[PDB]
């Protein structure tokens, strides 16, 4: 299978796992500035647009840690060996969004296909979820182009067992000489404590500071 | 009646509607800052305060948009034709606060003259709801005039079909040439999405940059 | 005992306590940034250091408002004669943490002395609570040394009747002339109101800002 069984008995974090899953359920957001001014040149000597290729970062990052890519599944604790993008698009004509995935891939210019490729089938279908079931191994993914903010949070009904990191970028903005992008990342504690998430950010902020390819 | 059923059968909304009221029932909150430089400046040429002055722009602004006036009545979706303010008033004397309405009106004056009324007769009452039952048409505005935050969050228990747009306003300050002013907007999935909310505050900050009359 | 029943009957926020307790149950969280310029300075000036220095003004500051202070005791609501500070500690080692107390005090060098008696004797514990049951008056403090954040919040799928503050602050970071510190608050609206933390706020910002001793 694409998952392995993690080990609860031997884990460090074991009695943290079962203290914020059952004893004092919840998950945090919270939202940092990156910069990404080295981003922005690397884009500007490039064909690639923004929006897939902070998809194809944040997922590569993801991709990195295994505290992100943990699941329940048949009552136990597993890890993907990988995860693809969920992400959202919006239509213009009727103002509405859909969510589309495709499979991630370490390289980029492959990853580029993959997307076009979803992008050109369902750029006309307004079905949330004109693909069907989302894939089980997923991160979701959101855009707010229209409004910066400094903040973001969802407010959710009911998140038991949910560990799929949730991120939310905003419109970018210039401070000064930088050019700054508000993210929000929500994950539930069971999994990820706030160095996980630092850790992260951290590493998503050195990859838009590093050559695409 | 003061408002209109809505065609949920034809809405390009309508699976998502269902899905953010039953399937994963959330909300969300942003908070982003509204630049008040030249509002400033036109509360500086007029006799209008700060206070009333933005509550009447956050209600005409929700008064644009249908979304933002959504609300379940005998089961069904309606759309309010026009919804009132219902906003906090702090009192000093025993450092608590009281929650009033007034009537909308697009006619500013008209506007003040009903605030002032309602601020009159109220002034010194510290019940929590002074005017008795909040008017069901309504969107909900409170300030924290002492402090400035970058974000701000409600964390309710239950939120279910309640649909009213939550809007909350923090102290506002210079940065550098500008005078910005915090406002975290809350909403619920079901009727808004982040495009929604963008439209909202780019109208807001529209308005601001306008004359007043 | 080290509380005093509270005054319900009599209390100027009775219907407030009841409404946000049962009626509509709710919290809300915010993130401010302090100035510590010349918290900096002072800390510079000394042989203290600025996690135990923020958890003793943090802890000066709640001892000092009695609405900070609140808990149900036999279900009625009380209020600590003082609360100790529960806050977390980072295992480099195992990259988990630890939460841990020690007993408040007025007088800075004999907090200073507790904190380092706690921290010799539990550095190496990975327990989640090495000291065992968590003291009932006590008040929570992180910290998210890693990153800066201009918005946190927890999402927590029961919060009922729990009335002590959870203060979380991120990496400090240069704003220009100052250094800002990023500190997120939240609370139960059955015993805050925004007052109430905009207040707490103001005043950890003036200790911050005065002689350590
Ligand atoms: O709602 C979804 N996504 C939003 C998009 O803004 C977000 O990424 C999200 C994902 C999961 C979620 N959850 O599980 O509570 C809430 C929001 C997908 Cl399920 Cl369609
Ligand atoms: O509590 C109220 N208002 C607060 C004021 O800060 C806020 O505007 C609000 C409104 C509704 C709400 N909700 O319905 O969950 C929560 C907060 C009115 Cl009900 Cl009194
Ligand atoms: O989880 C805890 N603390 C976190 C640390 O980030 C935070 O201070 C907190 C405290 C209480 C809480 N609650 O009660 O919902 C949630 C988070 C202590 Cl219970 Cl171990
Ligand atoms: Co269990
Ligand atoms: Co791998
Ligand atoms: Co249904
Ligand atoms: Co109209
Ligand atoms: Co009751
Ligand atoms: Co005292």
Redo the contacts with the bound molecule.
């Keep these: 299978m694409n998952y392995t069984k993690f080990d609860v008995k031997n884990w460090v974090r074991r009695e943290h796992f079962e203290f914020y899953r059952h004893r004092l359920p919840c998950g945090f957001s919270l939202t940092s500035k990156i910069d990404i001014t080295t981003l922005k040149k690397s884009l500007d000597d490039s064909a690639y647009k923004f929006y897939p290729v902070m998809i194809y970062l944040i997922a590569q990052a993801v991709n990195q840690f295994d505290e992100l890519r943990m699941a329940i599944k048949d009552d136990e604790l597993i890890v993907w060996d990988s995860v693809d993008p ?1 992400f ?1 698009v919006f239509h213009q004509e009727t103002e509405t969004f859909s ?1 589309l995935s495709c499979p991630y891939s370490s390289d980029i210019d492959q990853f580029m296909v993959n997307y076009l490729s979803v992008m050109e089938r369902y750029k006309s279908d307004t079905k ?2 004109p693909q069907g079931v ?1 894939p089980e191994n997923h991160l ?3 855009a707010l182009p229209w409004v910066n903010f400094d903040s973001f949070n ?1 407010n ?1 009904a009911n ?1 038991t067992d ?1 560990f799929a990191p ?1 991120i ?1 970028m905003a419109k970018y903005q210039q401070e000064g000489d930088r050019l700054l992008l508000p993210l929000s990342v929500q994950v539930h504690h069971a999994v990820c404590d706030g160095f996980h998430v630092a850790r992260f950010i951290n590493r998503l902020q050195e990859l838009c500071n590093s050559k695409l390819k």
């Design positions: 969920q959202t969510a949330l979820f989302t979701n993914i959101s969802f959710v998140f949910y949730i939310t």
